[PDB]
Amino acid sequence: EFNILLATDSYKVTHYKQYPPNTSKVYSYFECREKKKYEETVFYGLQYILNKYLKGKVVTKEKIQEAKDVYKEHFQDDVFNEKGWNYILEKYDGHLPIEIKAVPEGFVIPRGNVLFTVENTDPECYWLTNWIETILVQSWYPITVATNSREQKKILAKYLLETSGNLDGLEYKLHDFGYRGVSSQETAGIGASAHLVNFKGTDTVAGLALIKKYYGTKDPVPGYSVPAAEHSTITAWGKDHEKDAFEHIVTQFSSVPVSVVSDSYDIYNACEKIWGEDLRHLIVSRSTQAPLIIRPDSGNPLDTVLKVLEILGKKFPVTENSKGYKLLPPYLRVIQGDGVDINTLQEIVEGMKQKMWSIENIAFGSGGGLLQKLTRDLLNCSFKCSYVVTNGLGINVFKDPVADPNKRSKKGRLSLHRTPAGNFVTLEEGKGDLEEYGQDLLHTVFKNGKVTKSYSFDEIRKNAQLNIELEA
Amino acid sequence: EFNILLATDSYKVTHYKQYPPNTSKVYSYFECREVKYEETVFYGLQYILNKYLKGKVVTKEKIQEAKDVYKEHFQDDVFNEKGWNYILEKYDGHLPIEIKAVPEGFVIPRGNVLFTVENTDPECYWLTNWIETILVQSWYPITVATNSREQKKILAKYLLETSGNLDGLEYKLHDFGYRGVSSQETAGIGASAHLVNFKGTDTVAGLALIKKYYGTKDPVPGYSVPAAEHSTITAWGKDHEKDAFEHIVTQFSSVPVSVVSDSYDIYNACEKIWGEDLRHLIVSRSTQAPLIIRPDSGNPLDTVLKVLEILGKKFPVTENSKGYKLLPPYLRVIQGDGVDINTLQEIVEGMKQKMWSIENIAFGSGGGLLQKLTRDLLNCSFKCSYVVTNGLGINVFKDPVADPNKRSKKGRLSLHRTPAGNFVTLEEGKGDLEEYGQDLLHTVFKNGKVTKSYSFDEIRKNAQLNIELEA
Ligand SMILES: N#CN/C(=N\CCCCCCOc1ccc(Cl)cc1)Nc1ccncc1
Ligand SMILES: N#CN/C(=N\CCCCCCOc1ccc(Cl)cc1)Nc1ccncc1
């Protein structure tokens, strides 16, 4: 069973001895620190952590004993606030005397802004605020995935609109392949859910269950996929029978969309001779709602995509759309799911546009780039103490390293406000109390062991919409 | 509760309809295909076998659940209920799979077979690649273990060169990555992969993972000392940084203590506060309880050098037998900001050029150690190499025309020792020819049971550095 007493950085066990004596309050905030190409971030992930890890009765005398035994050996010393954790168990039945205020999930906030704040509600548990820093900072991941996925959606949106004239099927042009590419099962469910904030196409099944029990949707499921092949289902037929494999699969799924990886041996031969000639008759007859999706999986991503399209363009009836861009027959589409991140995605669509190919021809797939190739450095997701009450007197606290002004933190009690021009501003030193701005956009989401404010996954999706999507 | 029927890439649900008819055997393998990472530490599989694969993993509830989810997920019913119902009825929910693997901890050069997977029942031909996704995630404990070990080599070389020994080596790369990872489960897995090479960690979660799935003779596989964060310094007010330092070192006067000293001015705190104001509280400390000074900002190498040059002028510096300068035993340094395998090399090299010994310093790494790693780093890949259809086996493989590096091995594989004592993977079942001695892989899993396991002690012994093997 999970133990919150064991879910922190080791040195934080010794921190209750290091704060100024007569300290009754520790107040900390969380921000995606400004780096003086991601200027706005999607706040998502906190609600999962609150329900799964922080709420209810998270302390028992057993959990205190087990933490005591481990830390004795880990430190080779008795340094462990057993009294402190005992107080929480007896006074609050193991519930955390903590209040967390947060911006609503899905919200797209510029960087340098407070996203949530953490403070203890009991003077005795001043140490508790930063004990749970490690666990809360791990929200850097869903936030980073949601943000990075959304930025890729912006790029897709821009190029789709410019070459097709609309945004039809935009939410299905970036498919989640990264289930095997992540560091664990729990990460998989978390990362996939952050992607579904922006798109509807996923293969990482784990994200479906997470959303259902922690956020919920009106629809049965927030993500979808189609029957598709891997290299094993092709290669198993023997190197001489790739056509037999191709034909078997497209016939098995003759009435639904189907994707077939075609680069096992020679991607350019499979498109030109096999799909293009041998099995062309099984393709042209396919329904509009059930196209063949050809899938290259190797080589230079941009060069391979063009050449694939160029091959298919001469084997199949291509039409020029109203915007002047070339379009495959509706029974034929392409998915590029190899070596795609935000960088390469930009190069492909721009490459496709230069060659007059429409983005409606292609959807993308991303694995490690989508879910794993991300760090806390990217958005500078940081958790810092800004306000402390000692001897009844409150002071504004901050860090400001001489050799890195970028790492400077904010002072005092914070609040998030809408500017007169409709932008965002973070007020420091408790200046938000002056009422010179609107109401604090942060909402109490957690207090004294109970989640006080929840958001459906439907709301989070609505909040994180792109601007061009609102413009429709 | 976990459900293995829901723990695979979606499209694999449709794969049982794609293999050649009358296929009875699907046999697949795993490899680190193809800064250089020429050899990898195999570690992590045993966790996945125990936590996720062994025992009754299939029930009538889990089948119905997967039935319901996939129906909405595909907007159609393509889920193989009959196949999973066969497992439940015939084997009481136990997976008819056999997995052979190189012993955990082993350091194997790239391009070799690390483990293989195959079905043990003709009916469950489709089962082999169903569990691809879950098994491929071993890429992460393997990569962390490998990258952590590679960094250990770097520290070993420069420590031995500047100090003459390897004392304190397994404590010179501390885990700070707990907050820097994507989840709790990852933290435990990543930290345990780190603990294969080192003993210094702050990621608590890894300790319990090891005890449950691997086990050690010692109570714990990892250790830590009391230390400060920015909040325990800055909470005293900017005008009272000296008061915080003094309070902290006084609380932990008899145990090792580390104090982050860059809240405002790293070079001021080192020269004026530690070096003048509180100098009397430092030189009195025990050799078993040194003050550890922790910078946490600026250019990593430049900061470390200037810090050391400052302390060397405020404190009695000694020159060891190898001619390298050394702080007094009650004073050390830890650099835990911006440290990865690349920067770690630059720092120790920069220290050596400035005649500073590596014994003066330990390192802390967070994202670089646990998070900034991907599956393509060691090209960790899982591929089918052998199937039996119509009673006839065939050697299958991929070979993309535009990428020879994605070529996959053919036929039944085996791992052998070369006459010169190296590793070789034999393909096309040529291991049966007995020309290369016995197969080095062991059956670790069969029909729902872990059949061979290793202690964390064995793994550590297996993962030792050749320099450590020398004496
Ligand atoms: N193609 C492939 N691959 C794959 N699944 C199939 C993805 C299907 C994407 C099809 C295009 O978008 C759509 C997604 C959903 C819907 Cl309703 C319609 C269209 N899964 C992998 C591959 C590689 N690694 C892991 C999983
Ligand atoms: N100090 C710090 N950091 C921290 N706690 C304590 C870790 C223990 C470090 C022990 C270092 O022993 C040494 C050993 C040998 C030498 Cl020559 C110098 C030092 N944990 C963090 C920090 C930042 N972020 C996450 C965790």
Account of the 3D structure:
Chain B: Its main location: nucleus. Chain B: The modification Phosphotyrosine is found at residue 171. Chain B: Belongs to the NAPRTase family. 2 copies of one chain form a homodimer. By secondary structure, the first copy, chain A, is of the alpha+beta class. Chain A folds into 2 domains: 1-137 and 376-454, no CATH class; 138-375 and 455-472, Alpha-Beta Barrel (TIM Barrel). Chain A contains 16 helices and 18 strands. Chain A has helices spanning 46-54, 61-75, 82-91, 128-131, 133-137, 140-164, 185-195, 206-214, 231-235, 242-252, 267-278, 301-315, 342-354, 368-371, 457-463, 467-470, and strands spanning 23-32, 40-42, 98-102, 108-110, 114-120, 174-176, 258-261, 292-295, 319-320, 326-327, 332-336, 362-366, 381-390, 393-396, 415-418, 424-427, 443-447, 450-451. A 7-stranded antiparallel β-sheet of chain A has the order 14-13-1-5-3-17-18. In chain A, helix 11 (267-278) packs parallel to helix 12 (301-315) and helix 12 (301-315) runs parallel beside helix 13. Chains A and B meet through strand 1, helix 2, helix 5, helix 7 and helix 8 of A and strand 1, helix 2, helix 5, helix 7 and helix 8 of B. One 2-[6-(4-chlorophenoxy)hexyl]-1-cyano-3-pyridin-4-ylguanidine (2QG) sits between chains B (168, 171, 174, 176, 200, 202, 224-225, 227, 258, 292, 294, 332, 334, 336, 359, 361-362, 364, 366) and A (9-11).
